[PDB]
């Protein structure tokens, strides 16, 4: 039952290298290029559901997401094999042009036997208590390891659990593992659609500084991670501003 103590921000494309150097000086760790193709599944509109659950507590339907990596050979467009996989490759990715397309993501989802590992993440709206200076969100996640059968595609498995595909996005970025377990990611996001890819983070990089805590009941750990985040904020003042994003923005519930 993890809690993400998180702050958010944004930079332009011109200040990306400056922020990379600054965070390298802060942490002592080089940035780490990463990707995660996140596929989002909403409950089936043809299925009549009940607002109640197995117990007597009434809940909203929620989009549940599946995330996994894509190999970078599938993101290299046969023109940049020579440059190594580092933070410098994110300057080329500014427009909507991404080699990973809707046909190949559909091929990945439909597995056209055994399936690749996935991470199933379910997240509610962040906490409404206006006394925490950082955004606290609750995420429950499993690791889907393998699959088999004549109906082994992960999309049809999600249909069997009752969720249909809604949208998917590929995020590519660099992260820092700085002092005392704070993960700061800096990423671009593209939405993968049959009509064509679209750069959601248009002309800039999105910043997410988060800490994962296994027990959100541990108030001492919550306060320690929060004051680590504010220490990072104080260290980053003057250059970039860290602020709490909207809970309506971070809510993943299905509206009706």
């Amino acid at each position: 039952m993890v809690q993400q103590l998180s702050l958010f921000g944004s930079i332009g494309d011109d200040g990306y290298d400056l922020l990379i150097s600054t965070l390298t000086t802060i942490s002592g760790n080089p940035p780490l290029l990463y990707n995660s193709l996140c596929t989002v599944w909403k409950p089936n509109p043809s299925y009549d559901v009940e607002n109640v659950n197995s117990r007597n507590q009434l809940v909203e339907p929620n989009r549940i997401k599946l995330s996994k990596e894509v190999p970078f050979s599938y993101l290299i467009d046969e023109t940049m094999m020579d440059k190594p996989l580092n933070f410098r490759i994110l300057k080329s990715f500014t427009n909507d042009k991404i080699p990973l397309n809707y046909a190949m993501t559909r091929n990945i989802l439909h597995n056209t036997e055994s399936c690749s590992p996935w991470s199933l993440q379910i997240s509610d709206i962040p906490a409404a208590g206006n006394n925490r200076s950082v955004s606290m969100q609750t995420i429950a996640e499993t690791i889907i390891l393998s699959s088999a059968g004549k109906n082994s595609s992960v999309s049809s498995l999600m249909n069997g659990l009752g969720y249909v595909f809604e949208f998917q996005y590929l995020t590519i970025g660099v992260k820092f593992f700085m002092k005392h377990g704070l993960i700061l990611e800096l990423q671009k996001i593209w939405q993968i659609e049959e009509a064509g890819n679209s750069q959601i983070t248009s002309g800039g990089f999105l910043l997410k500084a988060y800490i994962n805590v296994s027990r959100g009941t541990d108030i001492d750990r919550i306060n320690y991670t929060e004051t680590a985040l504010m220490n990072l904020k104080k260290e980053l003042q003057g250059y970039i501003e860290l602020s709490v994003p909207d809970r309506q923005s971070m809510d993943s519930r299905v509206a009706h």
Binding site: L32, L33, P84, L85, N86, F177, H180
Partner: protein, 440 residues
């Protein structure tokens, strides 16, 4: 010039007496004015009088009157004017001398500062890191420690204050003693007696000084990690003498690794080789700690002794594995080759063996470069036999300092043995039974 305490204290005393005289004259003027003011005010003059003046004289003790308005004459106009001209000239001369002396002293100080900054820019590279420090004076301290490059060592951080030496025309580093560790190799004479030495390793400028301090802190780190490692190897002929020297006792040799401050022998080359193996293995520890801090968010904070040090264990395992190969070859020759009417033995090396980013793949391949240095020594000795009996013995060591033998035997005249042994005396009688029961 040079200024001394006695000249300082006489200047202190004379300026104290001059300020005393100035205060005395100003107070005398003030009390004259207040005693005259009490003639017509009687209240505010009493505030500025002295207590002594109030004790001696009463207020309204003085009176003054208007003598007629007089215009001063041109003779005293020109006398005051020529006084003004001369005294302004004297003040101009004093200002000239003060400005000249200040320019000379400030020129000397700025030549010293220009030499200091030229030394800084010819001395310091951009790779080096400098920070300000107090004592309250500002000083530049260069950080040469390995703690941000893989080391986990809170006992002594690498900080050196940079100071200017005009006499040496350079910059000197003050650590906020020179001790290098060298290795003694002791061999044994063929009389079961005390060991005798047979080889040992060998023992200004800004870059040389930075490299020297980095070498001292690195080699102190090496001895501290070796001393921490040696506590778990006490049962394998490894001991610590005086917390700065370790001793490795071998059935044929003897290694003394001592850290201390301050002719061609046979084993000098081996001494230098194993010394640079020690240094490279500590570099491998630093790279593994860096790889942990890159692959995990929490990162490695402290090193486990049995899992993550591995300095003397790989080299000691390799020399003990060579000795175990010698003993296994002797046992095979005595109990198999001397029994059968002619056979041969061959040796084979058997081997058994996402996160794509430039830095982590460099770390992975740059650890796998010394993977062969850090791996378990493993070797299979297979012996051919007249016909179809086949025999092999794979010698291996899971912990670096022990020995295990996995023996594989088969025959066509049937049985199949795949057994494991922890010592050599068991292998002796097992090979004897194999060659007495099936080969012969």
């Amino acid at each position: 010039t040079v200024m001394t305490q006695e000249q300082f204290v006489k200047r202190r005393r004379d300026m104290l007496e001059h300020i005393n005289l100035a205060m005395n004259e100003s107070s005398l003027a003030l009390e004259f004015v207040s005693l005259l003011l009490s003639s017509v005010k009687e209240s505010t003059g009493m505030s500025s009088m002295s207590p002594f003046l109030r004790k001696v004289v009463k207020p309204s003790s003085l009176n003054s009157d208007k003598i007629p308005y007089v215009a001063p004459t041109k003779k005293e106009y020109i006398e005051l004017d020529i006084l003004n001209k001369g005294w302004k000239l004297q003040s101009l001369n004093e200002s000239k001398d003060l400005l000249r002396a200040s320019f000379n002293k400030l020129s000397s100080i700025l030549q010293n500062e220009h030499d200091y900054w030229n030394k800084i820019m010819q001395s310091i590279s951009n790779k080096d890191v400098i920070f300000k420090i107090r004592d309250g004076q500002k000083l530049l301290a260069i950080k040469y420690g390995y703690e941000d490059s893989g080391s986990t060592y809170k006992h002594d951080r690498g900080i050196a204050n940079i100071r200017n030496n005009i006499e040496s025309q350079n910059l000197d580093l003050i650590p906020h003693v020179k001790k290098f560790l060298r290795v003694r190799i002791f061999t044994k004479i063929e009389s079961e007696d005390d060991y005798i030495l047979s080889g040992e390793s060998v023992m200004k400028d800004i870059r040389k000084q930075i490299q020297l301090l980095k070498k001292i802190i690195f080699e102190k780190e090496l001895m501290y990690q070796i001393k921490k490692e040696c506590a778990l190897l006490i049962s394998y002929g490894v001991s610590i003498e005086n917390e700065n020297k370790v001793i490795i006792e071998l059935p044929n040799e003897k290694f003394e690794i001592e850290l201390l401050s301050l002719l061609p022998k046979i084993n000098d080359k081996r001494a230098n080789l194993m010394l640079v193996m020690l240094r490279l293995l500590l570099v491998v520890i630093f790279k593994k700690t860096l790889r942990s801090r890159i692959s995990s968010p929490h990162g490695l904070i402290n090193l486990n002794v049995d899992d993550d040090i591995l300095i003397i264990r790989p080299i000691l395992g390799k020399v003990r594995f060579a000795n175990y190969k010698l003993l296994l070859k002797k046992i095979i020759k005595d109990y198999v080759l001397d029994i059968v009417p002619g056979s041969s033995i061959t040796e084979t090396e058997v081997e058994r063996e996402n996160i794509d980013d430039e830095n982590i793949t460099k770390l992975n391949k740059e650890i796998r470069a010394f993977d062969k240095l850090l791996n378990i020594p493993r070797r299979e000795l297979k012996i051919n036999l007249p016909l179809s009996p086949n025999l092999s013995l794979m010698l291996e060591s899971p912990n670096y300092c022990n020995a295990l033998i996995h023996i594989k035997f088969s025959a066509g005249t049937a049985v199949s043995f795949d057994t494991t042994f922890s010592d050599f005396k068991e292998v002796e009688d097992f090979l004897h039974f194999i060659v007495a029961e099936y080969i012969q």
